Each structure stands twice: as structure tokens, then as C-alpha cells.
Design a protein around this ligand. Sequence first.
Ligand SMILES: CC(C)(CCCCCC#N)c1cc(O)c2c(c1)OC(C)(C)[C@@H]1CC[C@@H](CO)C[C@@H]21
Length: 445
Amino acid sequence: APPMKDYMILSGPQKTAVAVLCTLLGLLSALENVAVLYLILSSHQLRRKPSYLFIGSLALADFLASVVFACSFVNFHVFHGVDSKAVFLLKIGSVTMTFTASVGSLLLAAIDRYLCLRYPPSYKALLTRGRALVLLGIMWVLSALVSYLPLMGWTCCPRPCSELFPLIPNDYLLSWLLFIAFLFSGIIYTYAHVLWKAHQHVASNIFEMLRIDEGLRLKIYKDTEGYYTIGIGHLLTKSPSLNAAKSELDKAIGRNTNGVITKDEAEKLFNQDVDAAVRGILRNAKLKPVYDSLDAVRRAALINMVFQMGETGVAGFTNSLRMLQQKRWDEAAVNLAKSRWYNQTPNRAKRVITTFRTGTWDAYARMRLDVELAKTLGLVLAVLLICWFPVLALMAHSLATTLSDQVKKAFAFCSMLCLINSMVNPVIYALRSEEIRSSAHHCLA
Ligand SMILES: CC(C)(CCCCCC#N)c1cc(O)c2c(c1)OC(C)(C)[C@@H]1CC[C@@H](CO)C[C@@H]21
């Protein structure tokens, strides 16, 4: 077995360099984690949600790691400290558990977001307050099992020992690294899916715009005016007869629908009405110049208006139409707010008016705050990936070839990044998370 002092390498000023960085970063990391752990339990709206149970569990795994790692790293390297032979297997095992639990905490946070975005109405039933804690425990137990194995019956006896960590073999590290790479593969595969489903909800085009405003329905419905309609506002007949509307439906689809149409039929019939709306605007002397100046987003906002009150109606908004052509967005936004169209349908008008001033689909963005929560995580996962890649790579190199004191020195400075990662992560939540930033004004006082 190799000696304990052989793993202590400090070429003069690098001993006081770890002493100034590791002690400052480790105390500052435990300062932010405690400001997050209490914050989740302090606010009534944050404690109930399962997403914040994984944010809290990360801060819990980070707080304990920030104190256990910074204590034992400065102790062993800077002050040449050796507590006991059994206590060391406890120190290392405690660091191994707290940092593995940070990874696992984020995997559950990534799984939480996958279910939320992939299956949104079935999320609240697929993931409950209890189920999240059951998943937390399972993750914490498997964290402790893989982390304390050396402490238990695993140690390097006839098998070669690791040149980075004392008393631990190459075979156990290989096992933990492969286990951690399995947790990372889980994170990468689950989050790649999270970004794909988040793009689906932020995706906008006119069909998805008017789907919100007009209201999609594959069954025959009645519009505000009282006439029979189908899909995205496709008025069938003004007539009070449903059988007349049912006949009009079979006429417009070319099949015996019996009151129900398919989604791609509603999309077919929609683009049929959009093409017809566009032609109407073009064959309108007052509307065409306005349409000519508007972009792919603002053009859709005008078609939205033509869908609502027809070409002859929209053409009447001469005051606003002049501003839309002159690109005076803010002046048109306030002028349109002074219309009867805003006084009759404020809900829809505000959104339409916004698309005219911003030039963005943000006004029609579904699940925006739940989607921005997935964005927060992405950055947290990026930092995690950045900081941990050099540390794990040196541990992988350790098992394949023999490494000299020059590599051993470099590993100690990479180990400092885990501490930086755990310090940076609660700052990301303190800046992006809107629910945390909104609670930051009330909870602290
Ligand atoms: C943060 C981490 C990268 C976690 C790796 C988990 C172990 C893998 C398994 N299974 C890590 C890196 C370290 O360099 C060390 C760590 C933990 O723990 C203490 C107790 C502070 C050690 C003190 C003695 C040093 C000997 O050179 C190694 C120090």
C-alpha cells in the first residue's frame, strides 16, 4: 500500500494558493446553498412543486459537498492532515456521496422537465410530491451504496491502488466513473429530449397563433356570433340548422365526416382560409400596401385581424394602417388600443397589437415560465459538464496508464472546479428563475 504523505504535493506557493482559493470558494459556496435550501421552504408556492424538490436536493448535495470537500481538501493538502485510516474512508465516501447526489439531483430535475414537456396534462399525475421524494430517496440510497463501498469491504489489497486517491483501487474507481458516465448519459439523453419538446412549445407560425385566438376544435362548434363553425374559425353556415352545417362540413372535406374532422383536415381547411385571406388583402386597395411592408410575423397579425372581422372591416383602421406602413409600432399599439376591436375582444387584441409592435411570437408563447425553468437547468447542466469533464478524464487516465507527480499536481487544481461549480449553480438560479427572483423581494425581509 502507498504512503499517505505521497499524495500530498505542494511546490511552495501552491500550498498557500489552495489555502486562499479553496477556503474562500468553499465558504462562499456554502453561503449560497443555504440561501437556496431555506428559500424553497420559506415560500409557500415553491415548497409544493416537485421541480423545486430537485433544486433543493441539489443545493443540499452542494452545501454538504462544499463543507465536506473544502474541509478535507485544505486539511490533507495545505495542512498535511491525516485524521485516521478508517476516518479517511469516511471523508472520501462523504465527498463521493454528496457530489454523486448533485448529479442525480439534476437527473431527476431533467426527468421532471421531460415529463412536464412531453406529457403536460398527465404530468401532475405522473409526478406527485410523494413520488418525487420516493425517487429522491432511491437516488440518495444508490448514491451512498456506490460511494461508501471502499469504506465497507472494498480497499486495495492484492489489486493495484489509485495514484490520485489513497487506499482505493483502480477497479473501484473504474466502476464509479462508469456509474457516473451512466448518470451523465442519462442526463444528456433526457435533456436533449427536454430542448426538443421546449422548441415545440416556443415554435410559432400562424396555425399555432390562430389556434390560440380562434380556438381549434375538431367537432362542430358555435362561434361568439352564434353560427356553426369547425376547426380554426371555419364558419360552415350562418343557418340555425346543424344538419345544414353537417352538410357544409361534408362538402368542404369531401368525405362523410359526421361532425368530426381529423387534425390535418383542420390544418388543410385552415391554409385554405389563409390563402383566401391573403388574396383578399391583395385584392384590397387599402390593405395591400400595409401587407407589402409587414414581415412574416407582423403579416400573420394582420391575417389574424382579417380572420376576426374580414377585409372590409380591417381596411377601416386607416389611422393604425398608416402607422403599420410607416413602422411607427408604439404609435400604432396605442392607437389600436383606442379601437372598438380592443373594447369587444381585449384578450385577443392585446396579443395581436403586441405581435405588431415586437415582431415576435412571445405574445402567443405557451408554458413560458415552465419552459424558462428548463432553460435555467440547461445552463446548470453546462457548468456541471464544463467543471467535471477535466476531473473525470484524469481519473479515467489513472486506470489505463501510470501517472507521474506532474499529473498528480494538475489533478488537485481540477478538483477545485467541483467547488466552483457548486458555487456558480445557485447564482444561475438567483438570476434566471423568475419565481426565485420574485420571491427574493419578499422572503429575505
Ligand atoms: C471532488 C472529487 C473530484 C470527488 C471524487 C470522488 C472520488 C471518486 C470515487 N470513488 C475529489 C477530488 C479530490 O482530489 C479529493 C477528494 C474528492 O476528496 C478529498 C477527501 C477532499 C481528497 C483528499 C485527498 C486527495 C488525495 O490526492 C484527493 C481529494
